[PDB]
């Protein structure tokens, strides 16, 4: 599996594959791994199935009370922070998940990555994260442009995901995109981005 | 002395418990919130008037989000609001977490209704000297009223603190649910002006909001409830010369 | 009661009138109820 | 005094307790709750009377679904009432767990009265002050109250709360055990009437039931209420004219 | 062991296999694996036959309480989330089960499966969970409109479990289909569903 | 009173808590502190006065440090004070933990604010006699009062303790909202002045501030405290023969 | 004045607490201790007056050591001090534990006065009703008072117990800051001559000091104790004909 | 006064903790129990004369072991003295246990004190009423009292219970340190013979001693004492006839 | 991934390797892997990137709370010795990790190097720890003059960090110097320091 999260000057643009594949096993048709925090911010998960469920809806919830408890919606910064807090005090169950956690906040657009052990880092740039970003990377890092803009971006994240897909097993389809072009908190769906990718075949 | 209020857990003779019945006159002298409920929505509306020019204006706060789209505001000791309204949001959250529900106006109101009765019937600990308005639209618009004891009950139209009893007298008469969002805004203004004998500033209020057709919370902003306030003015000036 | 009443009366020759009314009753009833056990205070401050 | 009469833990040389005594009294100042049990079911009661018309004619509701097959009716404080009713359900609930069956009438009843015997016993806490009338259909219809000494009496027909007095006496003479559902049901309604002394709208006081054709709650809305409430009527104002 | 699930146009119609055989012990012939949880949603099993039954009579508890305390039937979303939260803090006190709840509600209609290791995902209007989920997933997709009826929906659901008891030795015979009409909760069982069977000779 | 006033889990007839009104003489029995709240920073004055001269007046401060924007000043018992100060610092380093976030004035207030409530609700427990007044700057300058029973009120210019009552006065008439850091600072002094009732002198003072383009607590050494008092001091004379 | 002095968690309504005032009349029965800051030092003479031969020369004891470069003295209730003390040897301890740096006063003295101040709060613990001194030399010399409300003053010199209001006095006038160590414990001496109103012998006097040039903690030997008692001796004659 | 010696929470104005100090008249209503030092060693003699002669007089009994050089006798309640003469022996042997040395005269008597202390300074328990003194010799010589408030005085020869008054002021005229093992303990036997007036005999006194020589405790046969008997009984009679 | 580190006369210099990899995803090669615990008092981890900030964030916080509540700035073993005990308490999972905590205090310059499992041991002007320690002595020793200077300091802990990367196998390109000669926290960063190399190197 591979989500991948690149900041655009634009907003913030980040892409999933529902389907999780183990290596020959369909598991869901469909399934959430982006999950809406806020209309500014997500967390897209590349990992587990039914541990990053779990633990995404303890931070959504948590993640709206300390929006009501200051008056002021979450810095990207601080969600992020918390998931490393929360993952290392639960790594008493045995829950191994990465995470992208990224939006839009007061100080500008940032993504954090998260791995199951802690660890929370500024990323200004490209970001991808599972066992297909090794591939991910040399697709993303190549064609990023600091003039680069959500609407470029969302071919890109595409691209990333799709190449990623044609030397892994484990890689599922379903891409997704979410969009965060500070004005909406968008998701594509299957059916629009599959005809992105059916622009770069034939 | 009497000793039937030397403790909550000393029953008076007369059938009552008196210290609970103190702890209904804590929020009276506390100054007022009045919760108006039309079937458009509901509208959720505080003082803001209490104290002089050495204080901000924004005096944080009677009116406090819950959820986005819960409002909840408060009479009595802000003492025994503020950790009993950050209770409230976390228990809120925490039927949403468990559920992946938006907690119901109805619910929320018992669960702080219950809340309230821990304190009221441990001695441990004295029972809250606050009274709580709860305003939603879960899919269907409510209103509640906690007792400082911890007792529900539903209103068209409520009031607690000073002005409990001027809003009960005026609203007994010329309320009506089937009113507009328009004229239920307005209505329990010119009810809020005769409460502080005063005319209104839109600096004396907040004044929070919940939509039925949007199904959210926003809080109304000062000179956006402005012409609300012009329009209040007329009646408020009126009904005090008599 | 009574003196309540004399009171009331006494108040309206501080006002120059001899009509008595529900004004001048109000500040006769405050010096009973200022003897016995005040209800009036405080708000807060805290209790606000 | 009178007393020693200021703890629970005390015994008072009346070989009561004070505290406890004056704790039934507390439900007879909150509203009334008639029960009523025939041989087709038991039909419960419940005074809905609270305010002017500044309230909701709606006050939640005062007739609770405990199980599936058993409600209670409260008299007496709201308050106490909101947090008995919880512990009652959840230990239902918890029977259909540990045996997967129904829970008697009679065993829920003893151990609602369990939990405010347990506040009793302890110094720290106080008993609610709060009656419910305990009515369903195990297999058999029942009827129990439960009072806040931890006190539980099988009746036949009932009051308790306000109309406690009245509604025995008149029962006296009236109750037969071979009344139909709909006589049992309008009698129950007079009982009520004779409590407050007017005419009763089907708007203000709510009923529920469980038969034995059935077996499960149900409750009976305003309309479906009219022409019981008519009925009621007749009886109510010949009581007074005399 | 497997169970599926689609969404009608007028229902929800879903299905269990109801013989559960491992090695040569077979529990009963009559071992029930068909929860009935309210008066519209049903809850179908997969995996373990003692895991299935201790956890959903703590479910159909959960239901009525919640209706009573809210005054409102409980949604399939709430229960769905209730489960998973059950399992994920019952890690020490571990459940073996794939839940599939589904039903009409308020919200609608829509299923949701629930992981063993808990955490609930939705499906659009088809799922299979289990041994037999890959061809399970074909034979659905076959013949499924959103428009298809409950009459051919639980004649839908039986060629899919039907299929894939016989590819496998181990499993027995034994199928339940279950239908939920908004109307109806009818129960078809053993002798029913296999005469539904029957009219293709084997 | 009469034993309404002895404990902390009484109400009296008035719904007045008095053992906490109580606990508010306890801020006044302590020294003057001011704070003053400008749109360019935030100001802190205490006073440094010692009771003796053989009292060394190093460690006889009000002004502690609490995060890298955030000071706070205290008027009640020392002992109180420095225990409910040090709470406040392992808070706003917390949520630095869980956020890497400086916590806002605003937030830091509510939380300490239930830290006491918990105090003044229990009553095996008396609550803190102390105020605080939080003073920083997270995005814009904030200033804030805390009550001893744990209410929470924005202020734009304050004081607590024995010299309160003048401060008011002075700042009633005197006060501007458009006096910058510098001008204001020297206000602050003349209100100290007041208060204490004599021309300051740098050794009987402790001023600390936070302005907004240092996002940073620095403290006013007494060498950069001269020439404000010198100012200060002139308009102190003119006050003391009125 | 009774009813707020009746428990530790009731303020009387001056805001004072006479619980805790009374805790200052324990102080001031039990024996004197002077404590002297220097430049060069930090000196503390503690009373070790018999009253009879009975009791062994040395009483066990008026100068604990607490770390091998701080020392405390006692005056109060001396039962309290063995717990007080034993604590006040464990923080200094345990700091060298866990961040290997010796403890400075002003943190020992808040850590030790935080938990007197933890006996003040609660209800079910009354507060330490003994004070000590503290003394030590980390980067310069220091000298506090831990007061038993849980208060920390730092002093140039002081002096508590039954002879502390004579050298409250004393040093008024004779503590200047032109003082030597030798000439700084002459005076220790003398303002102790004053307090008990008689000459001096070694035996009656228990002095311990800390000196810069080691940053040790030695205790005076009964031997080089005598020369400066001969010094001392002769200003008390003098101050003794007065 | 009163008031303030019906709590162990409550100060006095005198300072005093007086239920402390009626927990110690508890130890002086019965009976001497008398502590002799020398160079040579520590003597412990205590009484044994309680009743008729149908109470065997030879057990029960002050004189408890606490180490195989430690010893104790009781003054006060015998209930207290069963639990914290326990409590003495196992910290004697906790030592052992820990450091595996044995346990020094001092360091018991200060952990023996701070444990009578934690009963005095925790409210809602209260002080054990008894004494003890603590006779040993680690390589030294000490005889310490040990006092039911948790305070430590270090005595050279001393006296707790009815004798105390008695041997004090005999102990002011006859003792030296120059005695012998020998000529202390006929002069403790004197001073006994004079606080219940009478010649003493073996039948109703106990001595237990533990040498400098050896560092055993011996328990002493009343065919050992009675040597000493008759050289102290020709002194008792004389000086009651003086 | 190794670390060094020197007290040079008038400053103290640490580097650190940005290379942390963990499957398929890399975790840091741009991102910090040196973290600020005071305003020069400096602390750097090999070891994960997951391990090594959530004990990071740790010894920060409570470097802040040293600073403000005795009113001192902490020295380097008050952080030092903290940061020992803290490893001790939790050994139930991986917390075992190679670190050094240096910089400037009021009684001189310090490093002290933390050893896993508890332990802080001082080390007069040469640490080094890490995989690629033995070549560390050799670069770093031969080298060092005790008036060696800070410019000369960080010239060298590249050298050391960077011939000792051949040898190594989990270390690689990318690399941090941080400099506090107690006037400056700078951190150097890939790109500084990959010009700094094209000398000594090439």
């Known amino acids: 599996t591979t989500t991948v999260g690149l900041?655009?000057?634009?907003?913030?643009?980040?892409?999933?594959?529902?389907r999780a594949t183990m290596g020959n096993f369909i598991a869901s048709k469909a399934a959430k791994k982006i999950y809406q925090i806020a209309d500014r911010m997500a967390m897209t998960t590349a990992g587990s199935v039914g541990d990053a469920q779990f633990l995404a809806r303890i931070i959504k919830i948590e993640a709206n009370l300390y929006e009501i408890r200051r008056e002021r919606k979450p810095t990207v910064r601080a969600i992020a922070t918390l998931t490393s807090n929360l993952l290392n005090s639960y790594?008493?169950?045995?829950?191994?998940?990465?995470?992208?956690?990224?939006?839009?906040?007061?100080?500008?657009?940032?993504?954090?990555?998260?791995?199951?052990?802690?660890?929370?880092?500024?990323?200004?740039?490209?970001?991808a994260?599972?066992?297909?970003?090794?591939?991910?990377?040399?697709?993303?890092?190549?064609?990023?442009?600091?003039?680069?803009?959500?609407?470029?971006?969302?071919?890109?994240?595409?691209?990333?995901?799709?190449?990623?897909?044609?030397?892994?097993?484990?890689?599922?389809?379903?891409?997704?995109?979410?969009?965060?072009?500070?004005?909406?908190?968008?998701?594509?769906?299957?059916?629009?981005?599959?005809?992105?990718?059916?622009?770069?075949?034939? | 002395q009497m000793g039937y209020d030397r403790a909550i857990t000393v029953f008076s003779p007369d059938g009552r418990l008196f210290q609970v019945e103190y702890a209904r006159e804590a929020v009276k002298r506390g100054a007022t919130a009045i919760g108006i409920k039309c079937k458009e929505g509901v509208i959720l509306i505080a003082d803001k008037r209490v104290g002089s020019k050495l204080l901000?204006?924004?005096?944080?706060?009677?009116?406090?989000?819950?959820?986005?789209?819960?409002?909840?505001?408060?009479?009595?000791?802000?003492?025994?609001?503020?950790?009993?309204?950050?209770?409230?949001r976390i228990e809120a959250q925490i039927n949403r977490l468990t559920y992946d529900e938006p907690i119901t106006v109805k619910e929320l109101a018992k669960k702080i209704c219950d809340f309230k009765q821990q304190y009221t019937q441990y001695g441990g600990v004295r029972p809250f000297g606050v009274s709580l308005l709860?305003?939603?639209?879960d899919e269907v618009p409510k209103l509640y009223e906690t007792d400082p004891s911890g007792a529900l009950?539903?209103?068209?139209?409520?009031?607690?603190?000073?002005?409990?009893?001027?809003?009960t007298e005026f609203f007994e008469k010329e309320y009506r649910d089937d009113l507009s969002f328009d004229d239920a805004?307005?209505?329990?203004?010119?009810?809020?002006?005769?409460?502080?004998?005063?005319?209104?500033?839109?600096?004396?209020?907040?004044?929070?909001?919940?939509?039925?057709?949007?199904?959210?919370?926003?809080?109304?902003?000062?000179?956006?409830?402005?012409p609300y306030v012009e329009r209040a003015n007329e009646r408020i000036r009126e009904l005090l010369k008599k | 009661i009574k003196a309540i009443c004399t009171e009331a009366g006494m108040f309206a020759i501080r006002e120059e009138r001899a009509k008595v009314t529900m004004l001048d009753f109000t500040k006769a009833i405050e010096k009973v109820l200022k003897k016995t056990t005040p209800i009036p205070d405080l708000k807060g401050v805290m209790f606000v």
Not at chain 1, 7 to 18: I, L, P, R, S
Not at chain 2, 65 to 74: F, L, M, S, V
């Open chain 1, 91 to 127: 790594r008493y169950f045995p829950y191994l998940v990465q995470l992208l956690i990224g939006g839009i906040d007061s100080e500008g657009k940032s993504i954090y990555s998260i791995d199951p052990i802690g660890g929370a880092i500024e990323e200004k740039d490209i970001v």
């Open chain 1, 7 to 18: 900041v655009c000057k634009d907003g913030v643009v980040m892409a999933t594959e529902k």
């Open chain 2, 56 to 88: 901000e204006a924004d005096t944080i706060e009677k009116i406090y989000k819950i959820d986005e789209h819960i409002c909840a505001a408060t009479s009595g000791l802000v003492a025994d609001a503020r950790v009993l309204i950050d209770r409230a």
């Open chain 1, 129 to 202: 994260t599972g066992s297909g970003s090794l591939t991910a990377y040399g697709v993303l890092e190549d064609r990023f442009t600091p003039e680069i803009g959500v609407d470029e971006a969302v071919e890109l994240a595409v691209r990333a995901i799709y190449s990623a897909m044609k030397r892994d097993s484990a890689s599922g389809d379903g891409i997704d995109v979410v969009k965060i072009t500070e004005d909406e908190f968008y998701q594509y769906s299957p059916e629009e981005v599959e005809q992105i990718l059916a622009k770069f075949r034939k």
């Open chain 2, 153 to 167: 009950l539903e209103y068209k139209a409520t009031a607690i603190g000073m002005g409990r009893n001027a809003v």
């Open chain 2, 185 to 226: 805004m307005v209505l329990g203004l010119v009810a809020m002006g005769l409460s502080i004998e005063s005319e209104l500033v839109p600096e004396n209020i907040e004044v929070g909001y919940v939509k039925v057709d949007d199904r959210t919370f926003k809080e109304v902003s000062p000179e956006e409830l402005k």
């Open chain 2, 134 to 137: 709860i305003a939603g639209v």
